[PDB]
Amino acid sequence: MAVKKIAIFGATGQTGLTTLAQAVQAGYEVTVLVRDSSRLPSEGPRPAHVVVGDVLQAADVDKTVAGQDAVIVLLGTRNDLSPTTVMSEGARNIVAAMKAHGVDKVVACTSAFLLWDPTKVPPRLQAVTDDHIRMHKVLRESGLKYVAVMPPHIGDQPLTGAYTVTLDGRGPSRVISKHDLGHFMLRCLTTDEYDGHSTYPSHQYQ
Amino acid sequence: MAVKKIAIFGATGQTGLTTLAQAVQAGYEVTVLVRDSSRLPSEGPRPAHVVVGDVLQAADVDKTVAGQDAVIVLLGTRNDLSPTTVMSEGARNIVAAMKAHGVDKVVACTSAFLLWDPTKVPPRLQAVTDDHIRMHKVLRESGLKYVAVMPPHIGDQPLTGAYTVTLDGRGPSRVISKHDLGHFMLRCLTTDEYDGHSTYPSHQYQ
Ligand SMILES: NC(=O)c1ccc[n+]([C@@H]2O[C@H](COP(=O)([O-])OP(=O)(O)OC[C@H]3O[C@@H](n4cnc5c(N)ncnc54)[C@H](OP(=O)(O)O)[C@@H]3O)[C@@H](O)[C@H]2O)c1
Ligand SMILES: NC(=O)c1ccc[n+]([C@@H]2O[C@H](COP(=O)([O-])OP(=O)(O)OC[C@H]3O[C@@H](n4cnc5c(N)ncnc54)[C@H](OP(=O)(O)O)[C@@H]3O)[C@@H](O)[C@H]2O)c1
Ligand SMILES: O=C(O)c1cccc(-c2noc(-c3ccccc3F)n2)c1
Ligand SMILES: O=C(O)c1cccc(-c2noc(-c3ccccc3F)n2)c1
């Protein structure tokens, strides 16, 4: 495997769990950063390496990025919609670690709202969207090989591998399953064609 | 009251650098206060005068303000996550220096958080916002002609000169390009219509 060692940030989350399971099945040697109170579930897939800590500590992010081939970022705030900088500050630490350790490839999830007319973004989701905007600027300005993944609504539909990938604009559907989103994050490790683009994965489940 | 000579504080920052560049291209005689002159670009537009020192040092601020027609303030304490007083103590020094030298016009950047509910502030930005509020009060209470510039997200989009300014709060956008923000700071030197007002610049790009 050319890319074989990967860090996943947010592996315990909705998309992270199925991304982790798919990566382990595909032969990746996965390192995760998990907060001490929220470890991976007991008998799901086991990653190769676990760092317990916080993306808001540069030291913990450095430990997680060291020695990787690539980084996948699925940070988020679960059902909490309050103002936050955890995604943007976490990305700042991830950028600094990747530069210090010679890692170039980062595939990172923000949101399709970065491609919406700003006056149409739902106000209830605007605090989170603000930090996605901050996070995207951090990653775009870093000079790293950054794939900006900007999904629409994340659902519980199957893994299909059959989704549309729209470059630098909104796509033709308004959902992507969490499993297909994770599949796409991993696909981005095997190609350079999305580097420096925004990507909107979406599908019609039928 | 033609403004020819300005001081810029914060000229090495993201907004400061493009404000300086635009000011030099437009013809202003610019004085900057920098802690490290090697953070100024060695090519292209350069300031007329460089004072090496610290905004916390009253004598360095006095040296920078002497003889100016107006002052632009683009200070920031980016890294600070917990109580900090650099911006407000700097503003106190700038105010005392402007009074001592008969400089009447100051255009200073805080943030749009000062226009929105305090609960909108991400916890890790509360300390910077608290000191923006302190700086804003220092400048409002000074009696100087003060334009308060309260931008939302500062982006990287190319200069347009086509942004909207709302004298109080809302707009097409929660983003202003750093280039457009610097353009607006300089526009405030050529008019008195924003004196004693808060301003919110924003724009929809792309
Ligand atoms: N329809 C949607 O839901 C939708 C649509 C578009 C975009 N998005 C965005 O897509 C991204 C992924 O969403 P998701 O639903 O898969 O994620 P999620 O379930 O919200 O999971 C967030 C992950 O981030 C981890 N995390 C949070 N703070 C951390 C910290 N300080 N240190 C280390 N890890 C931290 C969480 O760990 P813990 O286990 O410790 O909490 C969890 O693993 C999010 O940014 C989201 O806003 C969602
Ligand atoms: N980032 C955003 O999206 C955003 C949004 C709204 C408002 N704001 C606020 O906008 C203002 C400007 O932001 P920015 O990103 O353009 O600033 P920045 O890139 O963080 O630059 C801060 C500037 O202030 C200088 N500075 C800091 N401490 C100093 C000191 N003791 N003495 C002399 N100079 C000092 C810095 O000098 P050095 O180069 O020597 O460090 C630098 O030039 C800030 O107050 C910020 O909080 C930012
Ligand atoms: O409907 C669409 O096209 C669309 C596009 C972008 C994002 C979304 C979206 N829905 O829930 C969320 C969300 C829910 C919980 C937490 C954070 C979120 F971000 N985000 C929907
Ligand atoms: O990132 C910082 O250091 C910082 C410091 C002070 C204010 C701000 C700020 N105000 O509005 C916003 C904002 C608004 C909409 C979207 C994204 C944003 F980021 N951001 C940021």
Per DSSP, the residues of B58-85 read HHHHHHHHTT-SEEEE----TT--S---
Ligand 1 atom showing the smallest separation from residue A151 Cα: 6
Tell me the one-letter amino acid at A166.
Answer: T
Structure tokens at B6: 């300005």
Is B190 in the A-facing interface, judged by CB distances under 8 Å? no
CB atoms within 10 A of CB B14: 18
Instruction: Give which of B174, B177, B203 to mutate to test A binding, by max A Cβ within 10 Å.
Output: B174
Which residue owns the Cα nearest ligand 4 atom 21?
A: B153
Q: Which of A109, A147, A149, A165 is catalytic?
A: A109
- For helices B14-26 and B178-187, angle between their N-to-C axes, nearest 10 degrees: 50
- Rounded distance, CA A27 to CA A1, Å? 8
Is B174 in the A-facing interface, judged by CB distances under 8 Å? yes
Please give, rounded to a whole number of angstroms, the shortest distance from the CA of B202 to a CA of chain A.
11
The answer to whether B173 contacts A131, with C-beta atoms less than 8 Å apart, is no
Instruction: Give which of A119, A136, A141 to mutate to test B binding, by max B Cβ within 10 Å.
Output: A119
Which residues are bridge partners to B107 per DSSP? B72, B147
Which pairing describes strands A29-34 and B5-9: parallel, antiparallel, or unpaired?
unpaired
Q: Which residues contact B80 (CB under 8 A, 6 or more apart)?
A: B86, B127, B128
Structure tokens at B175: 């983003």
| Experimental approach | X-ray
Residues of A in contact with B17 (CB under 8 A): none
Resolution (A): 1.5
* Terminal CA-CA length for chain B: 37
Q: Which residues contact A87 (CB under 8 A, 6 or more apart)?
A: A75, A76, A77, A110, A131, A132, A134, A135
Residues of A in contact with B153 (CB under 8 A): 130, 133-134, 137
Among B199, B82, B78, smallest CA distance to A134 is for B78
Let me know the angle formed at the C-alpha of B75 by B70 and B79, rounded to the nearest 5 degrees.
Answer: 175
* Terminal CA-CA length for chain A: 33
Three-state secondary structure of chain A:
CCCCEEEEECCCCHHHHHHHHHHHHCCCEEEEEECCCCCCCCCCCCCCEEEECCCCCHHHHHHHHCCCCEEEECCCCCCCCCCCCHHHHHHHHHHHHHHHHCCCEEEEECCHHHHCCHHHCCHHHHHHHHHHHHHHHHHHHCCCEEEEECCCEEECCCCCCCCEEEECCCCCCCEEEHHHHHHHHHHHHHCCCCCCCEEEEECCCC
Inter-residue contact B73 to B15 (CB < 8 Å):
no
**B69-84 b/e with 16+ CB inside 10 Å = b?**
bbbbbbbbeeebbeeb
Which residue owns the Cα nearest ligand 1 atom 36?
A: A10
Which residues are bridge partners to A175 per DSSP? A153
Which pairing describes strands A105-109 and A164-167: parallel, antiparallel, or unpaired?
unpaired
Structure tokens at B126: 């509360």
* Residue B65 a catalytic site member: no
- DSSP annotation of B167: T
SS3 B165: strand
